Amino acid sequence: ICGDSTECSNLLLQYGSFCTQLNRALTGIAVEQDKNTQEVFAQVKQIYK
Amino acid sequence: ICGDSTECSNLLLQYGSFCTQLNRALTGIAVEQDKNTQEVFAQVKQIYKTPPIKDFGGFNFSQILPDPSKPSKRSFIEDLLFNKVKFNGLTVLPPLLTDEMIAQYTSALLAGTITSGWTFGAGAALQIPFAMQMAYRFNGIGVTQNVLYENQKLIANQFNSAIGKIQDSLSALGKLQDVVNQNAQALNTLVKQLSSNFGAISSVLNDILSRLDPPEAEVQIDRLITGRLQSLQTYVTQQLIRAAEIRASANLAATKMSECVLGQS
Amino acid sequence: EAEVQIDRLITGRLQSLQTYVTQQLIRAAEIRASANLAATKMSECVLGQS
Amino acid sequence: AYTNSFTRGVYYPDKVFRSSVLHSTQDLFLPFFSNVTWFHANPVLPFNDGVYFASTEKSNIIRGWIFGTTLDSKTQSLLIVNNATNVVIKVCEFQFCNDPFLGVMESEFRVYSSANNCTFEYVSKNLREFVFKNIDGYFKIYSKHTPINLVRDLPQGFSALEPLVDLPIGINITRFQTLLALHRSAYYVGYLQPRTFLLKYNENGTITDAVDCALDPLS
Amino acid sequence: ETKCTLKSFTVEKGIYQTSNFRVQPTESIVRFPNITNLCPFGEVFNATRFASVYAWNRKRISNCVADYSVLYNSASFSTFKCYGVSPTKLNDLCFTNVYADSFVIRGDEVRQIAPGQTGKIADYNYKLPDDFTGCVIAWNSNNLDSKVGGNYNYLYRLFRKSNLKPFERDISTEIYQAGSTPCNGVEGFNCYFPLQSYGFQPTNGVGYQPYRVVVLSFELLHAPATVCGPKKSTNLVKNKCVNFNFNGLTGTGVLTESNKKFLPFQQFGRDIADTTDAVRDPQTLEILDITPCSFGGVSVITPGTNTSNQVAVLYQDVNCTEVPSNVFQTRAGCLIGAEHVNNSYECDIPIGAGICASYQTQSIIAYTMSLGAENSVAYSNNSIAIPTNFTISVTTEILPVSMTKTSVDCTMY
Amino acid sequence: YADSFVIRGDEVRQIAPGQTGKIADYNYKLPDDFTGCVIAWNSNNLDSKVGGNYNYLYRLFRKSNLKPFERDISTEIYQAGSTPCNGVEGFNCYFPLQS
Ligand SMILES: *[C@@H]1O[C@H](CO)[C@@H](O[C@@H]2O[C@H](CO)[C@@H](O)[C@H](O)[C@H]2NC(C)=O)[C@H](O)[C@H]1NC(C)=O
Ligand SMILES: *[C@@H]1O[C@H](CO)[C@@H](O[C@@H]2O[C@H](CO)[C@@H](O)[C@H](O)[C@H]2NC(C)=O)[C@H](O)[C@H]1NC(C)=O
Ligand SMILES: *[C@@H]1O[C@H](CO)[C@@H](O[C@@H]2O[C@H](CO)[C@@H](O)[C@H](O)[C@H]2NC(C)=O)[C@H](O)[C@H]1NC(C)=O
Ligand SMILES: *[C@@H]1O[C@H](CO)[C@@H](O[C@@H]2O[C@H](CO)[C@@H](O)[C@H](O)[C@H]2NC(C)=O)[C@H](O)[C@H]1NC(C)=O
Ligand SMILES: *[C@@H]1O[C@H](CO)[C@@H](O)[C@H](O)[C@H]1NC(C)=O
Ligand SMILES: *[C@@H]1O[C@H](CO)[C@@H](O)[C@H](O)[C@H]1NC(C)=O
Ligand SMILES: *[C@@H]1O[C@H](CO)[C@@H](O)[C@H](O)[C@H]1NC(C)=O
Ligand SMILES: *[C@@H]1O[C@H](CO)[C@@H](O)[C@H](O)[C@H]1NC(C)=O
Ligand SMILES: *[C@@H]1O[C@H](CO)[C@@H](O)[C@H](O)[C@H]1NC(C)=O
Ligand SMILES: *[C@@H]1O[C@H](CO)[C@@H](O)[C@H](O)[C@H]1NC(C)=O
Ligand SMILES: *[C@@H]1O[C@H](CO)[C@@H](O)[C@H](O)[C@H]1NC(C)=O
Ligand SMILES: *[C@@H]1O[C@H](CO)[C@@H](O)[C@H](O)[C@H]1NC(C)=O
Ligand SMILES: *[C@@H]1O[C@H](CO)[C@@H](O)[C@H](O)[C@H]1NC(C)=O
């Protein structure tokens, strides 16, 4: 939104926790992606040859 | 949004049906939460009871049958599980089913299984002795049924020890704590968003109103309204996305209760 | 003076259209799961014995 | 000499009760593990943004401070004094001795030589901490009196400072000093910067612990 | 109200949120700090000896609690004019400094103490700026300042080189020089002493008797604040939705005795999520909790307008003792218009916490739903049941597969 | 509708929606969603006479500000203080019209 500008950053503080919410939403779906492939591929205990 | 004030309500009346939509959205979610529970637990016609004896072929179900010396009548393991897990227009409605009722549905599902095997899930409950039902189930996995009758005591001891290990492994439930945590944390943000000006002079609808005259104050009150309506839309959209995830989980639970409790898979 | 008054309408109408489009995505994701269950029941109950 | 504070100079940011609530604030604080000057027994110091100020003794050698921009006439200044009687706040235009002090007969007060145009008056071992700040024409003073079991060295520990005074002066400040009782018959100075802290509140509502959120990655 | 909420003339069975219930508070109880430093004017308005007119006094009233009402209504003042600000609004404003000037003049010279006048007093004794802000007060004092024979101690200046700047003061006593001839400090023609004296008497007509004057001048430099009017208050209550103000804290709610202990400099307490939930009374210094006043949602239970027009009402989570027959208390709120029975049926209209309603016994009733029949399997260690017949049954299952494809044209909308 | 009157020169800025002052408070108040237009022109040569034209009055005291487009031609003695006035002038009992 601001991109290395302090004038914009202090005005962005008047909206509260919008950016904290956005980062929290985006991080939770990055964690889900590793769970997704753990649940498909790591279904075996040993590495058989 | 407004909250008591009257200069706010007439200004918010200018936005149309934005608030009617949000209340409809939240009411649909709340009606879906009772249907989730009805679909998982009310899967039984009658309320079945176990007989006063407990002659089950050496198998011991005492840690999972209901406890008669309690107001809630929960079992030992259901008691272990239950010890591990007003505002600005916000309200919490109670569920339609008490959890006494839920414990009463689960104990009847249990007594149906221990006494009739899988027959009560397809029609009327037909009693069968528990060792013979265990021998029918050994056939279902491709083992010949004298392997059960010649090893009954050992098999019953192994069941009993494995049931004993579960309480120790209990006394895990993070999947149930996450839902509670995410919901409480999303409700705390909505309340904290009320102390932000959104680019007005202040964030409290009186001090803006008792320090300016109407033409001047309406400008700031519209900024406050815009911010507070954006916060509520964010909240409701995320509750809609989070309830569809809980519904897919209750659907998996209903299929498991049908296929793993009322039959052999 | 009409720019300032037209922008107030533009902002509101854009908000309302985008709310409509979000709620349709959320309703279509639910119709999709129902149709996916219907396709499995057609395979497993109509072309087989379950 | 210079010394190291450990966790010192925490004050209640304002009224409003409060209990167990790791509450987060942005304000002017003395950063943890800071570089605090040491003075023995003194000179004109700067102010520039608030001041932490501790002191240690059983007698009373530290007898108040003097503030301002020029510490003389032609501009106004504050004066906070304590003879063996009690505190005397005062705001005039003064003429301050370049080395002002008070004696200990027990006759004293070679501090100033002028008291013109007074715009505010008022009259009426040990570790004694003070936090002085000056915002929007108000000169705020927080303080705390803890008992050491040493005589004159800066100890370690946590102790939050409670607000004392509030003066609607309007005065400009850029410099300050100290006042001592001579011989006729140890003190530190930190400075405050805009930091963000995490305060832990007790169930009675007192601050028992804190976290400086810019010290290290763990914090 | 349900028909209006749905915008229809036929409502089908269900439960509908129709409006809201919000307790109402009355009266505006005020609170503040015990009437302390209220400024002791009784020194400038109650002096034993005033000051001359050519060397007026100048008291700089400072941080205090000023009550201009005791002045305004004292009815002892013959003249009370306010210029920058009408008098009744003085006890509702705050400035940086108030100055009070005091002196004594004749009776008919009180009309030169005003912005923009001329005359021997306003020219060179005491000049008021042209954008004055304060107020001018004056009262007769014949009995105090006038003595038998003549009180020659009240002087005024009657010659000066140039009119005064506003609020300027001149106590010099140099021999005036009217004509061009230099004076050399001795009197004579065109060399006059510059001070004259009112000889006040006890038998002088009004307009020659002495009047005492006080000029209050409110100034506002650029400080952070200062003295101002005295706020009013009342007697806070308890156990009643009220509209309160605690020296700045404006709110609404029920006030209740507390049992928490602030630190002796903390005024009010806050919750997590930052809402005021306790205060301290400024006069008696006791902590009081402020719980949100009653409130919730109102729902209407109807069997359907095609069955009946009777109705029952649920007042979401609220003790059936402050709602404003059948009043019935539920874990979900207070229910009005349905009777509670002891039977148990299958659920019809869901109220909550195990309670449902139906139109059966008529009217509307309450109760606890039924989980289902009661079947008792005759289980034993050597008994079996085997079926001897069967039934062929066929049931339906309905599933949505599609919805309607719509398109919008953003620009045309 | 067309309303007509005469005011000072620097009082023309109180004839506008949402203002305050002795004119807009209690002489002539414009609603807050006004629709029309306001026109004003100097008339020194017509209305001002040598010595003083004392025929143009205005109200300077009223109990409460006017409702928009409300009009008040009464001439009751104002009562500032608490003391009743009884229709005679005096301290805190003022005639309400100035010229
Ligand atoms: C079923 O198992 C439970 C153990 O979980 C048995 O109850 C315990 O029995 C032992 C001795 O066998 C006692 O020392 C414990 O105090 C019992 N725990 C209780 C009563 O909570 C129970 O006896 C078993 N059932 C049968 C029929 O043997
Ligand atoms: C403010 O003034 C009131 C009286 O105007 C004080 O009330 C007194 O309180 C003491 C308790 O210590 C009682 O013994 C007196 O009888 C009270 N007086 C009256 C007239 O009721 C009150 O204490 C004052 N405020 C403070 C903080 O002291
Ligand atoms: C100056 O002091 C006198 C005496 O204290 C005050 O006079 C009182 O005025 C009130 C109201 O008019 C009367 O009820 C009293 O009877 C008067 N006092 C006496 C002793 O009789 C006077 O108000 C003071 N002046 C000011 C400006 O405060
Ligand atoms: C099994 O059940 C069927 C009913 O489903 C019995 O057939 C019925 O017999 C009665 C009396 O004879 C007739 O009135 C009905 O018309 C019959 N039903 C049908 C669909 O034909 C049958 O007799 C039962 N068999 C046994 C061995 O009990
Ligand atoms: C404080 O700063 C001075 C500046 O030169 C330095 O010499 C000294 O070592 C510092 N003290 C500490 C404890 O870092
Ligand atoms: C203490 O110092 C103050 C400073 O002015 C003075 O007013 C006071 O009188 C002193 N104490 C005594 C006992 O003189
Ligand atoms: C301050 O003092 C000086 C010298 O005593 C004097 O000239 C000046 O007028 C004083 N300030 C004011 C505001 O009177
Ligand atoms: C304090 O000093 C600054 C110097 O930059 C000056 O601009 C300011 O006006 C002074 N403060 C006040 C209250 O005058
Ligand atoms: C203060 O806190 C202590 C410990 O947290 C507690 O025991 C005590 O009851 C509290 N209240 C007091 C000392 O009044
Ligand atoms: C609705 O009304 C119609 C005709 O009045 C009637 O046939 C029908 O049974 C009614 N429905 C119910 C549920 O009573
Ligand atoms: C409602 O208030 C009364 C009076 O205190 C109390 O007895 C009752 O228990 C309250 N209701 C509930 C559900 O507790
Ligand atoms: C329901 O049964 C209970 C039994 O405890 C009895 O006390 C109560 O009066 C009954 N209610 C009615 C409405 O008869
Ligand atoms: C009608 O009467 C009211 C009395 O309050 C008065 O103020 C108003 O001006 C009257 N209507 C008109 C059009 O004058």
Author numbering:
A (entry chain C): 742 to 790
B (entry chain B): 742 to 826, 854 to 939, 944 to 1037
C (entry chain A): 988 to 1037
D (entry chain B): 27 to 67, 81 to 143, 153 to 172, 187 to 247, 264 to 297
E (entry chain A): 298 to 621, 640 to 676, 690 to 741
F (entry chain C): 396 to 494
Copy text from the publication.
The spike (S) protein on the surface of SARS-CoV-2 exploits angiotensin-converting enzyme 2 (ACE2) as cellular receptor and mediates the fusion of the viral and the host cell membrane during infection. The activation of the S protein requires the receptor-binding domain (RBD) binding to the peptidase domain (PD) of ACE2 and the cleavage by host proteases into the N-terminal S1 subunit and the C-terminal S2 subunit. S1 consists of the N-terminal domain (NTD), the RBD, subdomain 1 and 2 (SD1 and SD2). Here we report the cryo-electron microscopy (cryo-EM) structures of trimeric extracellular domain of the S protein (hereinafter referred to as S) at multiple states and conformations, including the all RBD-locked, activated, S1/S2 trypsin-cleaved, PD of ACE2-bound, and the full-length ACE2-bound states.
We first solved the structure of the S protein alone that was purified in different batches and exhibited two conformations: the locked conformation and the active conformation, with overall resolutions of 2.7 Å and 3.3 Å, respectively. Transformation from the locked to the active state implies a tendency for S1 to become loose. The contact area between RBD and NTD of the S protein is reduced from the “down” RBD in locked conformation (locked-down) to the “down” RBD in active conformation (active-down) and to the “up” RBD in the active conformation (active-up). The S protein undergoes a clockwise twist from the locked conformation to the active conformation when looked from the S protein to the viral membrane, which loosens the NTD and SD1 domain by increasing the distance between the individual domain and the central axis. The RBD adopts two distinct conformations: “up” and “down”. Only the “up” RBD exposes the receptor-binding site.
